[PDB]
Write a structure and sequence with these properties.
The structure is a homotetramer. Chain A is built from 7 helices and 11 strands. Chain A is of the alpha/beta class. Chain A folds into 2 domains: about 140 residues, NAD(P)-binding Rossmann-like Domain (Rossmann fold), CATH 3.40.50; about 110 residues, Dihydrodipicolinate Reductase, domain 2, CATH 3.30.360. A 6-stranded parallel β-sheet of chain A has the order 2-1-3-4-5-11, with helices on both faces. In chain A, strands 7-8-6-9-10 form a 5-stranded mixed β-sheet. In chain A, helix 5 packs parallel to helix 6. The first copy, chain A, is elongated. The relative contact order of chain A is 0.18. At the A-D interface, loops of A face loops of D. Strand 10 of chain A pairs antiparallel with strand 10 of chain B, so a sheet runs across the interface. It is classed as oxidoreductase. The entry lists the keywords Oxidoreductase.
């Protein structure tokens, strides 16, 4: 199938991806890079696609390089203001034989969840979000949670909906979660847990719940391979795995 | 918005739908029929769309009639062999100002669940189904469960997948559910419960669960209105609400 | 088994209990009362135990009466300040052939949940609560939720525990629920749902969740019969079904 | 608090426990043993309690030894026919200053779950079990699942109950799980998951679900410390953590 290099291949993250390639039947693992060591090496080895996790300082450089030498790239490095997107967009004009994908999330379950919730939202009068995570976690609600809710809120504003039913005569502080474009979001910090979302939708007689659960820090990898196995047919720049999923 | 009649309007089922119309802002309730009383009455009253729950003996007749006088119809009556579909198809040639919809299920949650599971299946190595229902229930697994699983199995055969990982050295009878095109399906009969599905998908590090829950015999109604509010832009014959949902 | 009367037997509530008796093999249904009609009738009919749902104005009277004529009583009427308990306590001195039970909740699932959570709390560093209910509901969090949490908090203060791990650098308002004696409680209002609790406990490597679900306004009845079938061996005054359960 | 040794302290298992001690404020870690190296060392170091994971060949020996020199022991080694229990019982006559605990399970969540299910079973007409585990797993249903169900079945036979409601006209093979003393048990193998149980109870209007979830191979450790922190007040032989929990 595909020849593949990895950048930042020695982090926690690196190793898991490294392995995932080897383990895969259809993907030949063709390089590895410390962080800032010599990129040339990709071409020498003839890599078709790279997976990048480099410090946002480096990232833009390797990007330019990869694009220049026709290599497509699957990026999960953070820090992409619309300036940086605009840089990349610019790098990519009239090539149509090379792609970039920037996935702020690679947890397919998470992604799919985001996706489906958007699709579902127009049919249910009620909709809330609940998010759960180990207690060490710095911020509440999770980013993912927040995005979910915004996306729901979108789907509703579009396809013009009201606000949702709630006959709560003066509720207790905290008790109805954080409002996020009118979507309640509840954050639960629980020793033993890892990372989990749960989106509930309500209508007459029924509910639909979509819930994602990560058991383990390495859930990104299936994401990344979906990227790698398909970037090859998504030239140019894409942001969000959702788009690679063909939905 | 729309003028609407109902057939079989005195069953359990009828009443709930009757109300749902009135209650609705944009739908004028324009008739009611015992079961076999005179259909004429629809035209006299100038109905744009009907909702039908008649004994499968009657149904085909009212159908013909409705189509003949340009009225579109949302059918939840059972019993539609491909002969009967073929009848209807035939009734409908060169009209394109009239539709039928045949929804073997109107539980949106259920439908959406069916739908999303099909979309999700290609990404997860594991996938099982669990279905739960009050104990009175005659048959296991539920029809809905079975359909779900087949649809999953489809999505996998297409987008050619293997069978799923299961290192079970001689399992105990019953313990791994019923195989349904290679999809385990578990049926749970539980006093207090009503009707519920739950579809689990498994990959490295993660899961995605989609679960539908009906609290109440009347969950079909939101279905039916989605039908009514849209048949108007789906002339011809359609089978399955999934298609009205625009996904 | 037992001869039984009912007071307030024509409310929504009444009917369900009425039936529950008949339906029961071991319980002969021996009376019915409008609300304030003549109690005498119990003795005439020779009732061993009554179930009472009368307006808190009446209740205390029928109580006195029942106790006076040796009839035991299962009360689910609200409004029992410690004054009123003290009244009843007083009514009951040196009888030991008659009981009262006052159950502020008769949902066994709910009760058991309350109970088990108290028992479990000492083993888990983390513990949160989530409560879900149809959107019509007036108050958040539910009473039941709040009680749960207090009871948890108790079990922890006793068996002296710390506060729980939460490294949340300035969380968003609402997002971590309402604090209730240091227990986060999340309230979710969701069309289609009825009444549900869910108590999560967290420790190294694991969780325990206990979740109660009412599908239907009549879940109190099993409560009430547990009462009736056992008051006979709990003379005096008891408050809370928990105590009848023999745990 | 307590001085503590560990046997089999270099396995996967060992390390996690080692750490758990150090990390603990009130427990001084006072030894470590390869597997068969010299036990003397415990006394030299003055250990009050040991935690043992040795090959069932060794175990009985170290046991004898520990008991002989007054050291109490928390054992999670498998393989304890009633012969072996009888051995130990015999070792322990007239000491009452030393204990053993044999915990076939140390997952508190799991244990508590077992426990509560037994307590709950008498109140609900319906009761089923569902068990879920990574797909690598050799056997279905899990041991834990099976025990759960038996314990439920017990609690029912005692407190004489019927069989449960199920109007299933000829069900599909597999679909109603494995019968286990009349308790349906469903086994789900799901990539991404680890180890999980879920016990559902059903009555009129309601359910109670108790569900345990292990996220991680090390959930035994809280078990083990509950042991260690309490064996000191449970001289003699005990089998099952349930008994240390004081319920």
């Amino acid at each position: 199938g595909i020849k593949v290099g990895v950048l930042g291949a020695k982090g926690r993250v690196g190793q898991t991806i490294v392995a995932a390639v080897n383990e895969s039947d259809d993907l030949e693992l063709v390089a590895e890079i410390g962080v800032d060591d010599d990129l040339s090496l990709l071409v020498d080895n003839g890599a078709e696609v790279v997976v990048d996790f480099t410090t946002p300082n480096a990232v833009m450089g390797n990007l330019e390089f990869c694009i220049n030498n026709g290599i497509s790239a699957v990026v999960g490095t953070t820090g992409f203001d619309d300036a940086r997107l605009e840089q990349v967009r610019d790098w990519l004009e009239g090539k149509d034989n090379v792609g970039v994908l920037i996935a702020p999330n690679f947890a397919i379950s998470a992604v799919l969840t985001m996706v489906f919730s958007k699709q579902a939202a127009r049919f249910f009068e009620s909709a809330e979000v609940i998010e759960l995570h180990h207690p060490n976690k710095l911020d509440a609600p999770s980013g993912t949670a927040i995005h979910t809710a915004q996306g729901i809120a979108a789907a509703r504003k579009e396809a013009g909906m009201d606000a949702q039913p709630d006959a709560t005569e003066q509720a207790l502080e905290g008790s109805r979660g954080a409002s996020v474009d009118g979507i309640p979001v509840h954050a639960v910090r629980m020793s033993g847990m890892v990372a989990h979302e749960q989106v509930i939708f309500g209508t007459q007689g029924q509910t639909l719940t979509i819930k994602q659960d990560s058991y383990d820090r390495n859930s990104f990898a299936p994401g990344v391979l979906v990227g790698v196995r398909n970037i090859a047919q998504h030239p140019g720049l894409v942001v969000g795995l959702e788009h690679y999923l063909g939905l």
